[PDB]
Structure 1
Amino acid sequence: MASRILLNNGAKMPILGLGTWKSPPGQVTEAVKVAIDVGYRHIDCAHVYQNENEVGVAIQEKLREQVVKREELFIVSKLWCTYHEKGLVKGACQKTLSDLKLDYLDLYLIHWPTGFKPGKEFFPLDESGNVVPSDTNILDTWAAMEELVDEGLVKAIGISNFNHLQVEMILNKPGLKYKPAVNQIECHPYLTQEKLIQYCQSKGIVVTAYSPLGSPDRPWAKPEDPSLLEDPRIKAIAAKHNKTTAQVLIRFPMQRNLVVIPKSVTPERIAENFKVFDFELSSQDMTTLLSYNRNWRVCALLSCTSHKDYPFHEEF
């Protein structure tokens, strides 16, 4: 297992990164510092997480301390829905750069295919709780992303939560200048994504798997939900390999040629989650884990299900 994967922009991306959604701002600086100390070279960020300043403090300290060189880091962020208007994209990117204390991002993603009305609120609502859409075509948002590459603000651009038809729409964009480098999507044994993954990979788009542990700290968890970390079938595979269940859940996407971004603010878990380059799952293990698919999603919002670009009506 090599540590990086080659992107279609010619750059190499570390296959293991640290997630930061829900990482408390008064814990995430230490989390990122520890992560870098124990080997992480890829951090997954977003403006909507409201903690980029604090992530940036950690990155900057480790750069200043000469623990790692900037060229060795791979920092990812995402354009939030309320900034899909072409005239807002640069400012959104620059705010993220300022907070992260960087002069470029390695990868900048359209966070969701759904554009929302611009304003202070991240989810602008009408009086019934439907999100208020923007009419900016995603192809136009893509053109604005391409400009960021041409201005030196980002080395690569990509997409997140795009379904197969939406990926195809970008790939078929009239006058397309840069293909997406990455599609970042939810992926784990309960949402295995075979069709979408094969399609993206076939087009040279690298897939990043989010919520690989099933996001046990997600705000809307319910007792009746399935639980990857507690599934005795997965625990059994872990026990056989003398690894933790989390380690199996992280190794799984790695062996599908995916990038994976487990989140933790717990130092011992941050280290545990990185110790996944010293064992292999068999083909039988892989097929067994794939068999647990049930199309179960951590991330899908009722408020967006009527948006014309809602991604999860389509089979994939």
Structure 2
Amino acid sequence: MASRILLNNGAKMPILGLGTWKSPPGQVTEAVKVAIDVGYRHIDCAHVYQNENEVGVAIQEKLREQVVKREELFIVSKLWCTYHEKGLVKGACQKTLSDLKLDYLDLYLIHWPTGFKPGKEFFPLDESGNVVPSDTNILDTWAAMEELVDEGLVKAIGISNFNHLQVEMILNKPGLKYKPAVNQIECHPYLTQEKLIQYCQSKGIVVTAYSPLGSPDRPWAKPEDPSLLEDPRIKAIAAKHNKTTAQVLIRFPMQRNLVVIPKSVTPERIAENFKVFDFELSSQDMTTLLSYNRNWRVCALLSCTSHKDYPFHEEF
């Protein structure tokens, strides 16, 4: 298993990265330091995660320690929904760069296809709890992303949580300057994404799997919800390989030619999660894990189901 996948800009992206959603600012600096120490070279960030300064501290420290140089790192961030207006995109990118203490990003994603009213609140609500949309559209936001590449702020651009029709809208745009390099989507044994993966891979778009462990720390979880890490069937596959369930869950997308970004702030788990290059899931293991699909999403963006660009009405 080669550790990187080639993107459309000629750069190579590490297939295993560290996720940072819900990594509290008071804990994420150490997590990123440990991750770099044990070999992670790809960090998945976002402005909305409210912790980019603390990620940036860790990166700066490890650069000053001579542990890594910048060119060996693959830093991803994402344009939040309240910044989809063309005139806000550059400032949002530059805020992320300033917080991360970087002079470029390796990859910058449109975080969701839905634009929200601009302003200080990340999820602006009306008096009845509906998300307030903005008068923005995918193609104009994409054109603003393209400018970031032309100005050297970012090396590649991509999308996240786009359905195939939304991807196609960019691909077919008259005057397209850059194709999206990546679509980052939820993917795990309960939401296997067979059709959207087939679509993206056939169009030369690399897929990154988010919430590979089923996001047990997500803030809307219900106790009756399915739990991947506790699934006794996956535990049995893991035992057979002398690996943990988490390690099986990370290796699974790697063998589908996906990038995967498990999150932890716990040092032992950060190291555990990287130790996935020393075993192989069998054909039968892959087939069995795929067979657990239930089309079950942990990140369904439920406050946005009436937004014109809500991505999850389409089958894929």
Task: Report the TM-score, using the length of structure 1 for normalisation.
Answer: 0.99
Measured against aligned partners, the alpha-carbon deviations of 1:174-214 in whole angstroms (never above 9, x if no partner) come to 11010000000000000000000010000000000000000
Distance in 1 of aligned mates of 2:247 and 2:124: 38
Partner deviation per Cα, 1:119-147 (whole Å, 9 max, x = no partner)? 00111112211111111111000000000
Task: Report the Cα offset of residue 167 of structure 1.
Answer: 0.6
User: What per-residue deviation string (whole Å, max 9, x for no partner) do you get for residues 55-110 of structure 1?
Assistant: 00000000111100100000000000000000000000000000000000000000
- Secondary structure of residue in 2 paired with 1:128: coil
The 3-state SS of whatever aligns with 2:184 is strand
- Counterparts of residues 48-67 of structure 1 (less than 5 Å): 48-67=48-67
Tell me how large the CA RMSD over aligned residues is: 0.5
**Could you list the per-position Cα deviations for residues 269-289 of structure 1 after superposition, in whole angstroms to 9, with x for gaps in the alignment?**
000000000000011110110
Q: Higher mean Cα deviation, 251-260 or 214-223?
A: 214-223
1:1-316 aligned within 5 A: 1-316=1-316
Looking at structure 1, the residues matched to 260 and 10 of structure 2 have their Cα atoms a distance apart, in angstroms, of: 20
| C-alpha distance after superposition, 1:194-238 (max 9, x if no partner) | 000010000000000000000111111111101101111100100
Give, in whole Å, the separation in 1 of the partners of 2:241 and 2:49: 35
Deviates more, 1:47-56 or 1:218-227: 218-227
Structure 2: distance between partners of 1:245 and 1:303? 32
Q: Matched residues in 1 for 2:223 and 2:28: separation?
A: 27
Q: Secondary structure at the match of 1:124?
A: coil
Distance in 1, matches of 2:3 and 2:114, equals 33
Which whole-Å CA distance do the structure 2 matches of 1:190 and 1:141 have between them? 31
Deviant stretches of 4+, over 6 Å: none
- Tell me the SS of whatever aligns to 1:199: helix
Task: In structure 1, list runs of 5 or more residues that go unmatched.
Answer: none
Return the offset for 1:301: 2.4
Find the residue that maps to 1:229 and give its secondary structure.
Answer: helix
Shift of 1:162: 0.2
Shift in Å, 1:302: 2.3
Q: TM-score, normalised by structure 2?
A: 0.99
Greater shift in the superposed pair: 153-162 or 120-129: 120-129
Alpha-carbon separation, structure 2, partners of 1:298 and 1:63 = 35
Using the alignment, how far apart are the partners of 1:48 and 1:90 within structure 2?
16
Tell me the SS of whatever aligns to 1:144: helix
5+ residue gaps, structure 2, are: none
CA deviation profile, 1:251-276 (whole Å, cap 9, x unmatched):
00000000000000000000000000
Number of residue-to-residue matches in the alignment: 316
C-alpha distance in structure 2 between counterparts of 1:303 and 1:247, whole Å: 32
